[PDB]
Amino acid sequence: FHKIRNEDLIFNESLGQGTFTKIFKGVRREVGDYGQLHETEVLLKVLDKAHRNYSESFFEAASMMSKLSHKHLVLNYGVCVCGDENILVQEFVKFGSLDTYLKKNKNCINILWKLEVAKQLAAAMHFLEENTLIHGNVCAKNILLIREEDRKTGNPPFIKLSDPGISITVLPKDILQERIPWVPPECIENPKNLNLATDKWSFGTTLWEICSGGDKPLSALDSQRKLQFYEDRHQLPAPKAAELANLINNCMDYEPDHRPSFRAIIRDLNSL
Ligand SMILES: c1nc2c(NC3CCCCC3)nc(Nc3ccc(N4CCOCC4)cc3)nc2[nH]1
Structure with a gap:
């Protein structure tokens, strides 16, 4: 450095x-x-x-x-x-974090905006996957908005992914549990299980955030109930804007080996 x-x-x-x-x-x-x-x-x-x-x-x-x-x-x-x-x-990224932006503007961000940001995130994650580089903390708080949509010139929003912070492989267990459902079930079981498949799960959670106006999934559940949500193998509810619900659930597969590649994820997003 x-x-x-x-x-x-x-x-x-x-x-x-x-x-x-x-x-x-x-x-x-x-x-x-x-x-x-x-x-x-x-x-x-x-x-x-x-x-x-x-x-x-x-x-x-x-x-x-x-x-x-x-x-x-x-x-x-x-x-x-x-x-x-x-x-x-x-x-310094001018417009700040994506999760706060989605909440502030929930009543004027439409599905095409959400799709473009999802595509950009998937592009970043594909780049990391091709380089076999684990991020380990994909979430809307770690996405920053460089520029807003310009509806008059047809310019899309543009995002960047920020660094993951201190790794879940060293953080206290209670912090990992609070980070359900971004931290995948296998990493709750053993934080050493952090893998490229980790980021596919978290990408699914982040897409849920993008489609949910800055709501945080399972926020109403305390840590013990979050742990039991994984024990019971539950899935997140479909977002009200449900266009990406199937992709979310495909990414948030409890079997890590079944989570789709980011090439396949991008293909799915492009077909919408
Ligand atoms: C790397 N990491 C970054 C940020 N992280 C912040 C971390 C604390 C929560 C807000 C985002 N903010 C950045 N910039 C901000 C720009 C505008 C911000 N807000 C705009 C909306 O009104 C609240 C402040 C907040 C952060 N840039 C940045 N680069």
């Missing part, structure tokens, strides 16, 4: 929090191409000091996203490690 000086980072407004993290908008002072000085908007992700013993997995998650270059993956700019502070410096 490129090291960024603490003195070159300005922290501004809080945008939210993740698992053991706090997230801020900020500014990076840098020398750009041609030696020109710039002050650039950036996303600053800060690992909680109390959880600094997770720093390796915190940074490894961003490393994954920088292994490859792709138009649908958020860019990492560098890191700042100062004292007990572990900071990831990333691309």
